[PDB]
Amino acid sequence: CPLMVKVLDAVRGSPAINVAVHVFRKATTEEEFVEGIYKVEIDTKSYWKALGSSPFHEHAEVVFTANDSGPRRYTIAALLSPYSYSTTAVVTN
Amino acid sequence: CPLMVKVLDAVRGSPAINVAVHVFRKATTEEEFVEGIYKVEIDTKSYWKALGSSPFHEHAEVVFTANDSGPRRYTIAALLSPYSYSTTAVVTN
Amino acid sequence: CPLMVKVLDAVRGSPAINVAVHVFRKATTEEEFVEGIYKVEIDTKSYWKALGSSPFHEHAEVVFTANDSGPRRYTIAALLSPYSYSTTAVVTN
Amino acid sequence: CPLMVKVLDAVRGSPAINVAVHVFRKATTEEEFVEGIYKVEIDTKSYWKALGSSPFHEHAEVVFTANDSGPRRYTIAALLSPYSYSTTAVVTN
């Protein structure tokens, strides 16, 4: 039972490529698989995550306040987008 | 029982490509598979996530306040969009 | 049962490529696999994460205040986007 | 059961490539695998992380205040994006 994978075998020219090839062959127990390829996070927020095993167990008093306030400019040209013969310009006068 | 996969075998020219090829062959127990390819998160918020095993068990007093307030500009041209012969410009006068 | 993987075998020219090839072959117990390739985080925030084993157990008093306020400019051209014959310019007059 | 991987076998020309090839072959117990390749973090913040085993156990009083305020410019051209025959310029007049 052979397995064969061909991706972009013969490439002639000047391309602009993003390639992600994931080949997986397999064969109280737990197994976890977390694969992440080409992940972009520009403005990402996580406040409470994975607090753990029994936090704040007894009479916890938590006062959490969060403010997202301010001039923030995120100017991106060609995010995760390859180009071959083009003109990518960010002109901020 | 052979398995054969061909993606973009012969490429002549100047393309702009995003390629994601995932080949999977298989054969108290738990198995978890989490694959993420080409994930873009510009403004993503998660406040309470995966707090864990028995948090805030006994007489918890939590005061959570969240405010999203402010001038934020997210100017993106060609997000996850390859281009071959084009003109991608972000002109902010 | 042979396994064969070919990616970008014969490349003639001047391409601009990102290649990520992950080949996986396998065969109280726990196994965890975390693979991350080409991960970009421009403005990423994590306030409370993995606090551990039983933190803040007894009569915790936590006052957390967070403010994101200020002029911040993130000007990016060609993020995770290779280019072959192009003109990437960031002109900030 | 042979395993064979070919990536960019014959390259003729002047490309600009990022290559990441991860080949994995395998065969109270715990195993953890954390692989990270091509990770970029421009402005990344982690305030509370991995606090440990039972911190702040008894009558903790924590006052945490955080302010992100100030003129910060992050001008990047060609982030994680190789180019072959191009003109990458950051002109800040």
Residue numbers in the entry:
A (entry chain C), B (entry chain E), C (entry chain A), D (entry chain B): 10 to 36, 59 to 124
From the paper:
ATTR amyloidosis is caused by the deposition of transthyretin in the form of amyloid fibrils in virtually every organ of the body, including the heart. ATTR self-assemblage caused by mutations in the TTR gene leads to variant ATTR (ATTRv) amyloidosis. Using cryo-electron microscopy, we determined the structures of cardiac fibrils extracted from three ATTR amyloidosis patients carrying the ATTRv-I84S mutation, associated with a consistent clinical phenotype. The four structures determined in this study vary in the assembly of this gate, and we classify them as the closed gate, the open gate, the absent gate, and the broken gate folds.
The density map from the second 3D class obtained from the curvy fibrils from ATTRv-I84S patient 1 was determined at a resolution of 3.1 Å. The N- and C-terminal fragments have a residue composition of Pro 11 to Lys 35, and Thr 60 to Asn 124, respectively. These fibrils have a crossover distance of 608 Å, a twist of −1.41°, and rise of 4.8 Å. In contrast to the closed gate fold, the gate in this second 3D class assembles in an extended conformation. This open gate appears twisted by an angle of 180° from Gly 67 backward, resulting in new interactions with the N-terminal fragment. Based on the position of Ile 84 at a hydrophobic interface with Leu 58 and neighbor residues, we anticipate that the mutation to serine could disrupt this interface and then favor the extension and twisting of the gate. We classified this new structure as the open gate fold. The structural alignment of the open and closed gate folds emphasizes the differences between the two distinct conformations, with the residues preceding Gly 67 being the most variable. By tracing the fibril segments contributing to these two map densities back to their respective micrographs, we observe that the two polymorphs can coexist within the same fibril. In the open gate fold of ATTRv-I84S fibrils from patient 1, the gate is extended.
